[PDB]
């Protein structure tokens, strides 16, 4: 009534994440993924993720953000989060998580599968150097409705990837600390975990960056000052002028 | 131009039989048209509102050489008892969308590919 929304298909990872991983057990294995063994491993992973999320709240996220903002590394904050979760043991949910983990065969394969399932961003530098147009679809779209939809979507995906990466780091640290308590062949696993921890940490850092930016408000600044800054930057050789349509929201 | 009723077609006869609906005196049935430009085929997406359970049924309009017309049953999609606000069906990806407002005044709507196997499931939005 009055306004408008678009119904956009959730990505594979987001659609799976928004549904509890336990219910994924009731959906065909070839539908969850093409690799049935990989599908089972990922189903166990997402069951663990939902298990963690059922106890992790948004206030936890806020205090984690403050812990990162004032001096503390995100690895230390994640250690503190997992330590609080373990100290809150009344049922030993870590044992349930470990039981679900034995269902996973060589969890390095499954975690790298999540890595490839989320990899859609690649290291390329795109400056304002115009590419050769092939359709008029190059200039097509860019309206204010598109802007609103894109900003809502990036906020939502930033939040989802935020939660997913936090859970991934928590699970990495927990599995590294568990060692051989019900596990075998941990001699090679832990060293790979030591190597994969910093990379997931930097990925979490980037996704925290994007989520923080999506949470950041912006002030109403005159387009006159905007274009003055544009001219100054072009003079100092950090930007090249490109103008199609600039909008400031109301 | 003939000013006469050529035939009376029962939509439930092209579906596996449902006895109660055809004798039910319910009201609120809905018809939707979907034309395939490249196929020259017109599809009737008919929501028969049954107090038991409403249903979507997909038909194709067929006009024989003797001015006798019939409905070719492609699929039928049952629905749970709700106040159906709207429904659509597309032939480009061959899909049913349905939007209800339940008796608790809550907006619900879902989609399903009505050629993606035939025994009962819906994808929520």
């Amino acid at each position: 009534k009055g306004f408008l929304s678009f119904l956009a298909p959730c990505s594979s990872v987001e659609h799976l994440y928004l549904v509890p991983g336990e219910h994924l057990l009731t959906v065909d294995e070839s539908v969850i993924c093409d690799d049935v063994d990989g599908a089972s491993d990922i189903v166990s992973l997402i069951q663990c993720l939902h298990m963690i999320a059922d106890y992790i709240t948004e206030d936890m996220a806020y205090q984690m953000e403050s812990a990162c903002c004032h001096p503390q590394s995100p690895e230390r904050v994640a250690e503190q989060i997992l330590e609080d979760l373990i100290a809150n043991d009344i049922d030993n949910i870590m044992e349930n998580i470990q039981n679900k983990l034995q269902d996973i065969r060589n969890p390095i394969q499954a975690i790298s599968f999540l890595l490839q399932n989320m990899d859609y961003e690649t290291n390329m530098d795109m400056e304002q150097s115009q590419h050769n147009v092939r359709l008029n679809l190059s200039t097509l779209y860019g309206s204010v409705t598109a802007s609103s939809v894109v900003c809502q979507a990036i906020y939502k995906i930033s939040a989802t990837r935020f939660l997913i990466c936090r859970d991934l780091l928590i699970l990495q640290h927990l599995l590294l600390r568990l060692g051989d308590m019900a596990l075998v062949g941990a001699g090679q696993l832990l060293h790979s975990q030591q190597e994969l921890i910093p990379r997931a940490a930097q990925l979490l850092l980037s996704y925290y960056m994007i989520r923080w930016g999506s949470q950041c408000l912006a002030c109403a600044v005159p387009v006159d000052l905007l274009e003055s800054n544009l001219q100054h930057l072009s003079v100092l050789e950090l930007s090249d002028s490109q103008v199609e349509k600039r909008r400031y929201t109301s | 131009k003939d000013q006469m009723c050529l035939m009376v077609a029962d939509m439930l006869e092209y579906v596996p039989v449902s006895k109660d609906i055809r004798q039910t005196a319910g009201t609120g049935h809905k018809l939707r048209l979907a034309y395939s430009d490249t196929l020259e085929i017109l599809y009737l997406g008919v929501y028969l509102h049954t107090p038991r359970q409403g249903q979507f049924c997909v038909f194709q309009l067929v006009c024989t050489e003797s001015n006798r017309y019939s409905l070719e049953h492609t699929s039928s999609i049952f629905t749970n008892q709700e106040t159906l606000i709207d429904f659509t069906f597309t032939l480009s990806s061959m899909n049913i969308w349905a939007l209800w407002l339940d008796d608790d005044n809550q907006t619900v709507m879902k989609h399903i590919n009505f050629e993606r196997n035939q025994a009962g499931h819906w994808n929520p939005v």
Binding site: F3, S5, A8, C10, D28, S30, V31, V144, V149 | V125
Partner: peptide, 25 residues
């Protein structure tokens, strides 16, 4: 490969700026 189950999600469109079309009576 086999099959495709998809769920849509609501993304609010409309104008970030405040402007709506008034009906011509």
């Amino acid at each position: 490969s086999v099959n495709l189950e998809r769920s849509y999600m609501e993304l609010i469109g409309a104008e970030r700026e405040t402007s709506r079309r008034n009906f011509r009576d």
